[PDB]
Structure 1
Amino acid sequence: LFQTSYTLENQGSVICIPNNGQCFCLAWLKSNGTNAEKLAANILQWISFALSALCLMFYGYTCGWENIYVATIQMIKFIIEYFHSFDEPAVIYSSNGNKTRWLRYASWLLTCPVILIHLSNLTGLANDYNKRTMGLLVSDIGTIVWGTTAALSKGYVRVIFFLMGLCYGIYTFFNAAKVYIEAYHTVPKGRCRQVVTGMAWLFFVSWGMFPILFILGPEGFGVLSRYGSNVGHTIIDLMSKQCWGLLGHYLRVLIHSHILIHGDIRKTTKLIEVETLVEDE
């Protein structure tokens, strides 16, 4: 790792370290949090792992490849997180004293665009999508790029890249809302419109907490510890990925049964015009 043993000299003005080839920085030696927050984070890690495990078991029984991918990444991430939750480069101890959780932002790069692809095809009916789908993806990747760059930076540079990620996040939400709106008027009138509304609530609430936790954590004003920031991120990761994929799976199941019982019947409704699934011709 890095140097953790040192001697102060010359009345606290000189620091002497062993010439063992390791790197040294006092900022890296600050506490990550309390032992209660550590154990609380370790508890939610198994809860999210057991869910991801029970999801892969459940998903194994068209193809919901989106849910399989983020669940495979999720439990692979837990295997990495169980052994090296704070080692390099799972946590990047950079030369400016920062601690940046690359394990979190890498998993966002792996899973967040896949969820928006699922959002771009909520019904799952073959090659649907739209041209705004590329807009949802180009903006979300930039959101995580600026957020990672802001978490790595300090001072004004961090604020600049945080506001750049915030503008990309605003473009992501608005385009996502218009996807949820069209999907609401496309799915049948029954219980399908219920989960579509429920998926939207889980989406904007969980996705909205990530910029909130960025401000409250060490990357911001430090009202949360590093262990405290891992607890909140696990909660909204459990909502935005495991629970959101469960509902999206439940929606596509209700769609497939509707298409097999009543056929694929479309009634054009004006909003933009949507081909709504109906029961009778």
Structure 2
Amino acid sequence: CYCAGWIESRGTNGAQTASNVLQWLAAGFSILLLMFYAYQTWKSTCGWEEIYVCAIEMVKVILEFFFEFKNPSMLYLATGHRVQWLRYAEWLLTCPVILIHLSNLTGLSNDYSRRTMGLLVSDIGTIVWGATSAMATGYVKVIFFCLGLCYGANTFFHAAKAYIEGYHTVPKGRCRQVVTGMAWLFFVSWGMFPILFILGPEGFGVLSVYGSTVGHTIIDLMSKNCWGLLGHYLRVLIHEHILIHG
């Protein structure tokens, strides 16, 4: 199995160092966030979504530090394209949970809706089409990324509706400011993901594997750790509001 496209070049040895440093920072932040979440579950009210997302993020960060360019992290393919399977597998593991957190922003509604199902189905579909585009090479790559773009447009529309509903269901004041911050983080990072797909080796190679890893680590820290911590803060605020007035 020679396939000279498998060697290519992973980075510039500076993007590699930046990726390693960002992986260490992401692992440290995930460890600290998991410790804080455990402390909360022991003392305060904490949701399962933030803990699960942070745990998967920590596992993915460790696996990307150690075996990023190995199998179940990098499929090498007869087409000469190295597919970062770890990235898309972690997306499939976390993004549905992130959207289950987006629905029920205030951790009180034990019920859900058909809009949550639409969100989840569209998100799984867009991740599937993006992974297929990453493995696709050629016009099939363009077709599958356009399919993922349509599914992600549906996902973004449903997420925006969920964010408006959450903004209008939280108490007036700090709670809706936190909802606005969560919406900003969500949309900026989730829109940067397809941009990095386009700029990465999976699309037009502009970023290289290590530069794409740097950018994806930044927007994962934004969309998984920071967004989850903001959601936990929102739920803490909701609990305190219920204790005082509710």
Under a length normalisation based on structure 2, what TM-score does the superposition of the two structures give? 0.96
Post-superposition Cα deviations, 1:98-131, rounded to whole Å, max 9, x if no partner, equal: 1100010000000000000000010000414321
Partner of 1:9: none
Partner of 1:41: 19
Matches for 1:54-133 after TM superposition, within 5 Å: 54-61=32-39, 62-133=45-116
Q: Secondary structure at the match of 1:154?
A: coil
State whether structure 2 residue 210 is matched by structure 1 residue 227: yes
How many residues are paired up? 241
Q: Secondary structure at the match of 1:99?
A: coil
Post-superposition Cα deviations, 1:160-184, rounded to whole Å, max 9, x if no partner, equal: 0000000000000001101111111
Structure 1 residue 260: Cα displacement: 1.0
Partner of 1:183: 166
Question: Any stretches of 5+ residues in structure 2 without a counterpart?
Answer: 40-44
107, 120, 124: which one aligns with 1:137? 120
Post-superposition Cα deviations, 1:218-255, rounded to whole Å, max 9, x if no partner, equal: 11111111111000000000000000000000000000
Partner of 2:143: 160
Which amino acid in 2 is paired with 1:96?
T
Mapped partners of 2:20, 2:228: distance in 1: 23
Which structure's residues are more often strand, by fraction?
Answer: 1
Mapped partners of 1:185, 1:237: distance in 2: 27
The percent identity for this pair of structures is 74
Asked if 1 retains the 8 angstrom alpha-carbon contact of 2:6 and 2:80, the reply is yes
Q: RMSD value over aligned CA atoms? A: 0.9
Mapped partners of 2:109, 2:168: distance in 1: 18
Partner of 1:206: 189
Question: Any stretches of 5+ residues in structure 1 without a counterpart?
Answer: 1-22, 264-281
Moved over 4 A (4+): none
Mapped partners of 1:189, 1:202: distance in 2: 20
State whether structure 2 residue 223 is matched by structure 1 residue 240: yes
Post-superposition Cα deviations, 1:202-233, rounded to whole Å, max 9, x if no partner, equal: 00100000110111111111111111100000
Q: Secondary structure at the match of 1:230?
A: helix
Which amino acid in 2 is paired with 1:114?
V
Mapped partners of 1:40, 1:242: distance in 2: 19
Structure 1 residue 63: Cα displacement: 4.1
Which structure's residues are more often helix, by fraction?
Answer: 2
State whether structure 2 residue 6 is matched by structure 1 residue 28: yes
Q: Secondary structure at the match of 2:14?
A: helix
Structure 1 residue 78: Cα displacement: 2.4
Mapped partners of 1:75, 1:113: distance in 2: 17
State whether structure 2 residue 195 is matched by structure 1 residue 195: no
Mapped partners of 2:217, 2:61: distance in 1: 11
Which amino acid in 2 is paired with 1:26?
A
Which amino acid in 2 is paired with 1:174?
F
Mapped partners of 2:176, 2:72: distance in 1: 43
Q: Secondary structure at the match of 1:235?
A: helix
Q: Which has the higher contact order (CA 8 A, sep 6+)?
A: 2
Q: From the CA coordinates, give the structure whose radius of gyration is larger.
A: 1
Partner of 1:278: none
Post-superposition Cα deviations, 1:26-73, rounded to whole Å, max 9, x if no partner, equal: 111100110000000000001111000000010011540001111111
Is the deviation greater in 67-76 or in 34-43? 67-76
